[PDB]
Design an enzyme around this catalytic site. Structure first.
Site, PDB file in Angstrom:
ATOM      1  N   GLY G  32      20.776  60.598  53.198  1.00  0.00           N
ATOM      2  CA  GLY G  32      21.649  60.775  52.060  1.00  0.00           C
ATOM      3  C   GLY G  32      21.213  61.864  51.109  1.00  0.00           C
ATOM      4  N   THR G  33      21.862  61.901  49.954  1.00  0.00           N
ATOM      5  CA  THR G  33      21.639  62.948  48.981  1.00  0.00           C
ATOM      6  C   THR G  33      20.225  62.883  48.425  1.00  0.00           C
ATOM      7  OG1 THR G  33      22.484  61.561  47.194  1.00  0.00           O
ATOM      8  CG2 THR G  33      24.046  62.986  48.324  1.00  0.00           C
ATOM      9  N   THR G  34      19.881  63.921  47.679  1.00  0.00           N
ATOM     10  CA  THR G  34      18.589  64.065  47.033  1.00  0.00           C
ATOM     11  C   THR G  34      18.695  63.702  45.560  1.00  0.00           C
ATOM     12  OG1 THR G  34      18.090  65.859  48.562  1.00  0.00           O
ATOM     13  CG2 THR G  34      16.715  65.652  46.627  1.00  0.00           C
ATOM     14  N   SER G  77      20.977  56.861  45.202  1.00  0.00           N
ATOM     15  CA  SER G  77      20.708  57.694  46.358  1.00  0.00           C
ATOM     16  C   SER G  77      21.198  56.969  47.598  1.00  0.00           C
ATOM     17  CB  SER G  77      19.233  58.020  46.463  1.00  0.00           C
ATOM     18  OG  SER G  77      18.979  58.780  47.624  1.00  0.00           O
ATOM     19  N   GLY G 164      15.987  61.187  49.282  1.00  0.00           N
ATOM     20  CA  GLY G 164      16.905  62.006  50.038  1.00  0.00           C
ATOM     21  C   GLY G 164      16.280  62.640  51.264  1.00  0.00           C
TER      22      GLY G 164
END
Ligand SMILES: Nc1ncnc2c1ncn2[C@@H]1O[C@H](COP(=O)(O)OP(=O)(O)OP(=O)(O)O)[C@@H](O)[C@H]1O
Ligand SMILES: Nc1ncnc2c1ncn2[C@@H]1O[C@H](COP(=O)(O)OP(=O)(O)O)[C@@H](O)[C@H]1O
Lengths: 272, 250, 242, 244, 273, 238, 246
Positions: G32-34, G77, G164
């Site tokens: 996933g995202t940071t 996150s 992330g």
């Protein structure tokens, strides 16, 4: 054709090179060789002779050896056979291998044969749902009839041997086929161990300046084959220190060498 | 939340013998030894603990336990599944019998309700049975001294002299010979005591063992003296030297 | 299995639902039974599978089972499940009579006890009623005869005659031959000799085994005496002479 | 949860149209003990052949193949006694409820159709086992006089004359199927019992410790029946009067 | 069969004891037992011993036991065979087991000669009352082995040694002394025991630097007995990848650190007593 | 089941699951120890620190639940706190209801008896932890108790825990057979500390700071951690 | 727990004592995202990579941050909605605290709640763990804090944080930065020091562009409350950090 053994070899042991189990050292005698030697005395009363037997017990305890001295003292024809070769690649090789052994016995009778282990080919159910495990049962059925079917023989009967004595059919375990069963327990009773240590020990080099009761009463839950190991290892407690005859502390240094492994296997996390 | 009312143990295998029951008591036999016997004038129970490591104290862990001043019990099986149900058990004797009447219960039916603690667990959803087969000893007035075994199913038997656990069979094979129909106590404890010592190695120290009895009242312990209608607590265990002086006799 | 919709819920790829067709596939292993409505009467019949002359003759739990003076019930197969339907029907009878100040119909009754089973097979943590039943009797102050058959799937379908359970297909073909929507039997004894005769193929002439009632206008309910039956069992056999 | 807690095998059918847990349970009893019950004209009896007979096992204080419900009805249990002390605790109240609101004792046809309807209750609802049990009954009334019944773990009860249960029974009936008259006084009934039990069991020695039974009568004219469980000495009386 | 006539590959070839570390006492516990009958057999008759017959090992794998299983070949000069406890089974029943008779006799026709046998847990079961339709086959295959070493057929002047990574599950009837008269455990050693093993690779290849071990080996409380030959080459595996063909103590560190966590992700599975 | 859930045993006569729960306690390679005194006790727990972004005041395996009581955990943290929390919440009950504060023994007669209940009704898995306690009671003196995933709670003369509770003890029971005392002297809450640290480093042989170790002492109406500058006072020996 | 095994369902200790139904989750958040969490010497600051997955998205329209009652900043996150769930529990329980004890909420006892609600979704069989790795950091009279969150509940107190797909990349700088500043930076300057991360972390994913958002909380700048930052501040930053990385 199956084989037979005379005096090419022997086991090279004796009743005197063994000891203990003395009540079994006579029940076996009356079944086998005394009928072969002393016949008339009970044919005075003409009862049918007892015949080949079974003999079980935990692993070891001389379940396999006691034969070996009486084998040395046979005065009849005798074999060297175990169980798990009766099987063969093809189908009829098995039963065909075994019909003739009694013919071989009968062709050389009076005599007797032996098996070192049988529990592989003797079980309760004669299991059905596989093309393989019936063809063993056929090896069971055939002797089960050749033993005490029509007109078997004069001989005494196929002498069993196992590590266990419940797995296998009663049809084999009943009179006329296994007229005697025998247990070989050790129990560590003190009446006999004070001999058979000495029996095993008297044959071998030994210092007459040494303890011996340092362990007998000290240990109470023992078997019959392991004990050779301690007074095997006692010698090896010597030569490591290049000693040429044993000393007293060798046994004490050996006592927990073979035995003392009492219990540590996941004690707390056993059940709770 | 807890979507598993699915009845475990309710699946009779086709032979008709249940599954976990015959597995549960597979533990208690794998468990330690105990026993408890009966006489004409008194009762006894005892076992041994197996600390399993030295530094751990061996007087806080009371394997024997009280549940009334006239009843006492022991087990040999699993431990932590014992101390929970006594707390239910002794609570019952206050509730089901005492608060409603006033008296403490007989033992013809305490065991019955302690059984009902057990079968309600082998029959509901997703609950194992208690890995214990304990036994209780008590005293009454319609029946006096008495003894009872139980089992994790619920079937309680009465008995006269019994062991359960590791080598109980050897002991049950032992008692009945040197047992007697009127072996009163101070020889009972002896035959009881040695009835264990065969079943053990390691050490037989006086501190190693607990035991107890149900004999005759002892209002030196009752404390609140000044009431003739307050008999003595008939139950009382023993310390680790008055056992260790019947022990020097052997 | 509180809830859990075990396999009662799981439809089939064919469409069916396993445990239901399984049920009345099990029902046929039990005692047969039968019903008839003629001109003015209604008739029922069952059997007793052969005991060793120990099956208690006096207070046997039978197949006919009253509800009121004017309604009965016969059934087939399982028995422990039969006893509750008999209860939670006549419950509603004493209730229906009360809170409506007048007794039950029969088209009110079969709807209930055929609708109940649907709840015992369209719910969770429930097994169906492995049973099939029929209803019989008149409405109040009416000459009309009615019987309704119902089965565990929950459907009720009226009839003029019908049989349930064991070897019914060995039987009902006999009845469609004789019985006809043309013209009833005249009166009581007519239906019975017709009724009984149809059984005989599975009967080994055990007159003791079979047990019968009738139903009549004004709720003149009755069960009949083995002698009265047996003297039909024989004269019907007297007619065999060919 | 569902995919791995097998809550499905309970309360469902075979494709061939039957039940497993019940045909198992009905079989599961036959490992257990044995009991009988008959119906004499004068009175009623029962019996029970235990198997638990270790010598030091106390077997003389009270009993386990037999129980009571009230002052006029008795039974002969078979099964596992963890699944007997509950419904009995639900039965004994029932009499003490039926009287409590109608000031009379139970028409005995009614309560077995109250005990069966909890045994059935589990083998339809839930995912629970049934009570692995089979019962006998023995009771008296006025609208039917004497009685005798028999039950099952499913909930199918039946009235019967002279019955055995538990082990090795299908011959036991066939061992007596000739011997049952209908006159049947009491003292020509017990001779059948021992003549029944003493031809079916482990050891013909048959210590009294391995046996229990009861009796019912009408000893007070125009009076109730006498519930009497027999105790060892008086058990032993008829045990040897027969000469065995 | 000809298959017995194929296994024997390096029956003699000496790879001696100097190329090993960590086990200076096990071998003292083993050079004792084997060679002496096969060097000076009259001692056990000088003293009155039923001589030994059978040894084994145990401990986790990738540890150096198989080296020991062959390092004795160097001392003797005498014969040897290698063989598993796996490549025996086949379809035709008994054919797997007949071989066992074929081979012990094949020992007797040329000796001093002994046997090795890996991974015996496959033939290392407790004889069950209940079974499948076929798993009892290995049990009947087993007990021939259980027989022949101590059976009615007497034996002398040959030896067997076996090994597992799972001492449990074994039929105790095998463990009867007389069938094997001494056991031993080979563990993952201590750091120093792990340290001779570290340097033997440097003892062959071109070293360049000073010792620089004691802190390197501070990481060595995790390894096995056999991942270091990888480690040793792995240093020069990429010391050279910069085309620097004269190795250093600079580059192994990147290796020896690296191996530990790639080893970690599927390591420490079990230990088997 | 029989190898996945808990509420059905094995065929053998035991089970397999809970035997694993003991095993995850060693899933942090930590060691601890605890000892006694006339008026004082000690507990210690070596502290590891990977990547240095942490706030080592926030890191703690210790939870002084109440006055008179103290505890430290083993195994992982998150399944420990819930075992600590209801403990803390319980002392708001025994006090508010039975007048006064909980002794340890009633607590480790309790905090285990429900862990048993977490292995009958299997809806809640058993807590992945073994767990200890400390206190200075009024009748029996400074008492220690151990607890566990299934509840053979036990009093102690001292303890040992981690992956290495076989030899740390052996460095301790060596002399409680020699000194002939379950008790230990040098009563004041300092001198007994060095005893705990000197005998373990004798078993381990590794040097430390205030950074990497800790402290906890049971004292009358007291329990607390503190500053561990007294690492130095071992130095005077050799 | 490879097949015919234990990883599939929760609350079954794999024989090395593990819940392999859990450690699958931390790969999810790793996919996933940071985002990050930093401790100013007087408070906190956060960040995140908002992810243009298309052109039709609007700046400052669809945030990736929620917030506690007044002060406690909280990020997400991995998966957002499961994150969004317990943040509804975040604002919930802290009001039960406030109404009762008449004050705002301290952060250590806060995790004492939120570090159990997720733990109490690990132990049953009929639930799933929160597939996230949350961060929350705030301020109080005892100073400021920062707390990272793992699904099994292994929350500790950090001074710098990361998550992330860019962890080992990013957190390296956070270590390579702080050693050069044992002082502990004030607020405005750590901002651009952190935006340096994200425009460096995205190096993985150069198929696309992106954007970000910023948090802000300190004593000297908000009275210790949470908010975002707009205008020239962060615009002076994004070009700055973008300027000094080429
Ligand atoms: N009582 C004894 N007297 C003399 N020697 C003994 C005795 N007991 C054991 N031994 C020694 O131990 C060995 C026992 O071999 P044994 O005949 O017991 O094989 P076994 O294990 O019984 O065979 P199997 O496994 O087929 O039953 C013998 O070689 C013998 O030297
Ligand atoms: N003590 C040791 N000395 C040298 N090499 C070793 C040692 N232990 C293991 N090895 C390495 O392990 C490999 C094979 O060892 P082996 O005896 O088969 O152990 P295992 O049987 O556990 O695999 C060889 O490549 C060898 O270099």
């Amino acid at each position: 054709s199956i084989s037979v053994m005379g005096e090419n070899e022997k086991p090279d042991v004796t009743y005197a090179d063994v000891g203990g189990l003395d009540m079994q050292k006579q029940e076996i005698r009356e079944a086998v060789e005394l009928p072969l030697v002393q016949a008339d005395l009970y044919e005075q009363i003409g009862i049918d002779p007892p015949r080949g037997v079974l003999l079980y017990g935990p692993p070891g305890t001389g379940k396999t050896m006691l034969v070996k001295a009486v084998a040395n003292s046979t005065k009849a024809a005798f074999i060297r056979v175990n169980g798990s070769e009766f099987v063969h690649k093809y189908l009829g090789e098995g039963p065909r291998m075994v019909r003739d052994v009694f013919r071989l016995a009968r062709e050389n009778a009076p005599s007797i044969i032996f098996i070192d282990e049988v529990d592989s080919i003797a079980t309760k159910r004669f299991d059905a749902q596989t093309g393989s495990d019936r063809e063993v049962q056929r090896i069971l059925i055939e002797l089960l009839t050749q033993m005490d079917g029509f007109d078997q023989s004069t001989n005494v009967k196929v002498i069993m041997a196992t590590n266990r004595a419940d797995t296998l059919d009663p049809a084999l375990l009943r009179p006329g086929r296994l007229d005697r069963k025998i247990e070989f327990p050790s129990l560590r009773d003190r009446r006999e161990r004070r001999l058979i240590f000495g029996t095993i020990a008297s044959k071998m080099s030994l210092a007459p300046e040494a303890d011996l009761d340092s362990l007998i009463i000290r240990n109470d839950s023992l078997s019959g084959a392991v004990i050779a190991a301690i007074m095997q290892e006692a010698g090896l407690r010597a030569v490591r220190k290049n000693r040429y005859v044993i000393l007293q502390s060798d046994l004490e240094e050996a006592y927990a060498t073979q035995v003392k492994t009492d219990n540590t296997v996941d004690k707390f996390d056993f059940y709770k | 939340m807890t979507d598993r009312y699915s009845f475990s143990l309710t699946t009779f295998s086709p032979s008709g013998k249940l599954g976990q029951i015959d597995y549960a008591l597979t533990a208690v036999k794998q468990g330690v030894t105990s026993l408890g016997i009966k006489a004409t004038n008194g009762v006894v129970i005892a076992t041994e603990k197996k600390s399993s490591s030295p530094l751990a104290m061996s007087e806080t862990l009371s394997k024997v336990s009280l549940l009334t001043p006239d009843i006492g019990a022991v087990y040999s099986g699993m431990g932590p599944d014992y101390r929970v149900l006594v707390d239910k058990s002794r609570k019952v004797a206050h509730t089901s019998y005492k608060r409603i009447y006033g008296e403490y219960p007989p033992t013809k039916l305490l065991v019955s309700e302690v059984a009902k603690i057990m079968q309600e667990a082998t029959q509901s959803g997703g609950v194992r049975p208690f890995g214990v087969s304990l036994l209780i000893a008590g005293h009454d007035e319609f029946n006096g001294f008495s003894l009872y075994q139980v089992d994790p199913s619920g079937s309680y038997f009465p008995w006269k002299a019994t062991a359960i656990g590791k080598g109980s069979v050897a002991a049950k094979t032992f008692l009945e010979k040197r047992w007697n129909d009127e072996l009163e106590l101070e020889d009972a404890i002896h035959i009881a005591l040695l009835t264990l010592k065969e079943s053990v190695e390691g050490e037989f120290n006086g501190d190693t063992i607990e035991l107890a009895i149900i004999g005759d009242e002892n209002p030196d312990l009752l404390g609140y003296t000044g009431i003739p209608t307050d008999k003595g607590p008939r139950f009382r265990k023993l310390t680790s030297q008055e056992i260790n002086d019947r022990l020097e006799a052997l | 299995m509180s809830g859990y919709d075990r396999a009662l819920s799981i439809f089939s790829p064919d469409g069916h639902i396993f445990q239901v067709e399984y049920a009345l596939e099990a029902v046929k292993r039990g005692t047969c039974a039968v019903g008839v409505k003629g001109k003015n009467c209604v008739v029922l019949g069952c059997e007793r599978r052969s005991t060793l002359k120990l099956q208690d003759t006096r207070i046997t739990p039978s197949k006919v089972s009253k509800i009121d003076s004017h309604v009965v019930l016969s059934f087939s197969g399982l028995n422990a499940d039969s006893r509750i339907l008999i209860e939670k029907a006549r419950v509603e009878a004493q209730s229906h009579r009360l809170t409506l100040e007048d007794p039950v119909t029969v088209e009110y009754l079969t709807r209930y006890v055929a609708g109940v089973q649907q709840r015992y097979t369209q719910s969770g943590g429930v097994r169906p009623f492995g049973v099939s039943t029929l209803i019989a009797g008149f409405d109040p102050r009416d000459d009309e005869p009615k019987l309704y058959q119902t089965e565990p799937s929950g459907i009720y379908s009226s009839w003029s005659a019908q049989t349930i359970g064991r070897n019914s297909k060995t039987v009902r073909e006999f009845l469609e031959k004789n019985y006809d929507r043309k013209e009833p039997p005249a009166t009581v004894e007519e239906c019975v000799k017709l009724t009984v005769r149809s059984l005989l193929e599975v009967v080994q002439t055990g007159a003791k085994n079979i047990e019968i009632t009738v139903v009549k206008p004004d709720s003149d309910i009755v069960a009949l005496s083995s002698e009265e039956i047996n003297q039909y069992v024989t004269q019907i056999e007297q007619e065999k002479q060919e | 949860m569902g995919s791995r807690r097998y809550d499905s095998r309970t309360t469902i059918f075979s494709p061939e149209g039957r039940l497993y847990q019940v045909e198992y349970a009905l079989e599961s009893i036959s490992h257990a003990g044995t009991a009988i019950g008959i119906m004499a004209s004068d009175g009623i009896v029962l019996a029970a052949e235990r198997k638990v007979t270790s010598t030091l096992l106390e077997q003389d204080t009270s009993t386990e193949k037999l129980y009571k419900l009230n002052d006029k009805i008795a039974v002969a249990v078979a099964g596992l006694t963890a699944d007997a002390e509950i419904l009995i605790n639900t039965a004994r109240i029932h009499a003490q409820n039926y009287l409590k609101t109608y000031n009379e004792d139970i028409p005995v046809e009614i309560l077995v159709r109250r005990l069966s309807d909890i045994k059935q209750g589990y083998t339809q609802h839930g995912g629970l086992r049934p009570f692995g049990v089979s019962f006998i009954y023995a009771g008296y009334d006025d609208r039917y006089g004497y009685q005798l019944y028999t039950s099952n773990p499913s909930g199918n009860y039946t009235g019967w004359k002279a019955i055995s249960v538990g082990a090795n029974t299908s011959a036991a009936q066939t061992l007596l199927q000739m011997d049952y008259k209908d006159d049947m006084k009491v003292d020509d009934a017990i001779e059948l019992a021992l003549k029944t039990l003493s031809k079916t069991t482990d050891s013909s020695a048959l210590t009294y410790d391995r046996l229990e039974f009861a009796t019912i009568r009408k000893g007070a004219n125009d009076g109730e029946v006498y519930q009497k469980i027999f105790k060892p000495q008086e058990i032993k009386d008829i045990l040897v009067k027969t000469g065995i | 069969d000809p298959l017995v006539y194929n296994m024997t590959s390096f029956e003699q070839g000496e790879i001696t004891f100097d190329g090993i570390g960590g086990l200076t006492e096990q071998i003292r516990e083993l050079r004792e037992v084997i060679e002496l009958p096969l060097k000076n057999p009259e001692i056990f008759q000088r003293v009155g011993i039923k001589p030994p017959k059978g040894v084994l090992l145990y401990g986790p794998p990738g540890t150096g036991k198989t080296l020991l299983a062959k390092a004795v070949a160097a001392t003797i000069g005498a014969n040897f065979i290698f063989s598993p406890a796996s490549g025996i089974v086949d379809k035709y029943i008994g054919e797997s087991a007949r071989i066992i008779r074929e081979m012990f006799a094949y020992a007797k026709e040329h000796e001093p000669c002994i046997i090795f046998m890996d991974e015996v847990d496959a033939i290392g079961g407790r004889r069950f009352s209940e079974g499948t339709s076929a798993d009892r086959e290995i049990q009947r295959t087993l007990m021939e082995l259980l027989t022949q070493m101590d059976g009615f057929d007497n034996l002398g002047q040959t030896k067997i040694i076996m090994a597992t990574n799972r001492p449990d599950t074994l039929d105790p009837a095998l463990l009867r002394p007389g069938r094997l008269d001494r056991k031993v455990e080979i563990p993952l050693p201590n750091e120093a025991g792990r340290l001779e093993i570290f340097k033997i690779h440097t003892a062959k290849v071109k070293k360049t630097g000073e010792f620089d071990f004691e802190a390197a080996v501070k990481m060595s409380d995790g390894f096995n007995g056999a991942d270091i030959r990888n480690c040793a080459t792995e240093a020069g595996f990429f010391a050279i990848r910069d085309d620097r063909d004269h190795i250093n103590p600079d580059d192994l560190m990147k290796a020896v650190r690296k191996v530990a966590e790639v080893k970690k992700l599927e390591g420490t599975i079990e230990y088997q007593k | 089941g029989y190898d996945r859930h808990i509420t059905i045993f094995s065929p053998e006569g035991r089970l397999y699951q809970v035997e694993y729960a003991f095993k995850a306690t060693n899933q942090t390679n930590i060691n601890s120890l605890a000892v006694r005194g006339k008026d004082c006790t000690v507990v210690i727990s070596q502290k590891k620190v990977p990547d240095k972004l942490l706030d080592p005041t926030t890191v703690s395996y210790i939870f002084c639940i109440s006055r008179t009581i103290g505890m430290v955990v083993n195994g992982p943290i998150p399944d420990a706190r819930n075992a600590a929390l209801r403990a803390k919440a319980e002392a708001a009950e025994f006090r508010y209801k039975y007048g006064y504060d909980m002794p340890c023994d009633v607590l480790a007669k309790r905090m285990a008896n429900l862990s048993q209940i977490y292995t009958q009704r299997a809806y809640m898995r058993p807590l992945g932890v073994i767990l200890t306690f400390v206190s200075v009671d009024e009748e029996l003196g400074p008492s220690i108790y151990k607890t566990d995933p299934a509840g053979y709670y036990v009093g102690y003369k001292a303890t040992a825990t981690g992956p290495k509770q076989q030899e740390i003890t052996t460095n301790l029971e060596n002399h409680f057979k020699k000194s002939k005392i379950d008790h230990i002297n040098e009563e004041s809450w300092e001198k007994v500390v060095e005893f705990a640290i000197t005998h373990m480093i004798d078993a381990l042989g590794t040097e430390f700071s205030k950074n990497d170790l800790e402290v906890g002492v049971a004292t009358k109406d007291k329990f607390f951690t503190l500053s561990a500058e007294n690492i130095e006072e071992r130095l005077v020996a050799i | 727990s490879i097949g015919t095994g234990y990883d599939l369902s929760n609350s079954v200790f794999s024989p090395d004592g593990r819940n392999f139904q859990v450690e699958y989750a931390v790969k999810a958040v790793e996919n996933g995202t940071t985002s990050i969490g930093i401790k100013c010497n007087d408070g906190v600051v956060f960040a995140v990579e908002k992810l243009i997955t298309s052109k039709l998205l609007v700046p400052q329209k669809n945030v990736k941050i929620q917030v506690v009652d007044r002060h406690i900043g909280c990020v997400y996150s991995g998966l957002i909605p499961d994150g969004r769930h317990l943040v509804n529990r975040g604002r919930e329980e802290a009001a039960s605290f406030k109404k009762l004890y008449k004050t705002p909420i301290p952060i250590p006892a806060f995790a004492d709640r939120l570090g159990q609600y997720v733990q109490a979704h690990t132990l049953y069989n009929s639930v799933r763990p929160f597939g996230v790795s949350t961060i929350f950091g705030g301020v109080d009279k005892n100073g400021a804090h920062l707390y990272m969150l793992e699904p099994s509940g292994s929350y500790w107190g950090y001074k710098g944080a990361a998550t992330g797909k860019g962890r080992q990349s990013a957190k390296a700088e956070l270590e390579k930065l702080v050693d050069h500043h044992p002082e502990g930076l004030s607020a405005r300057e750590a901002v651009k020091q952190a935006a340096k991360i994200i425009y460096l972390a995205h190096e993985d994913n150069k198929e696309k562009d992106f954007e970000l958002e910023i948090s802000w909380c300190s004593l000297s700048e908000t009275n210790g409350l949470h908010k975002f930052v707009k205008g020239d501040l962060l615009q002076e930053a994004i070009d700055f950090a973008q300027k000094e990385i080429n």
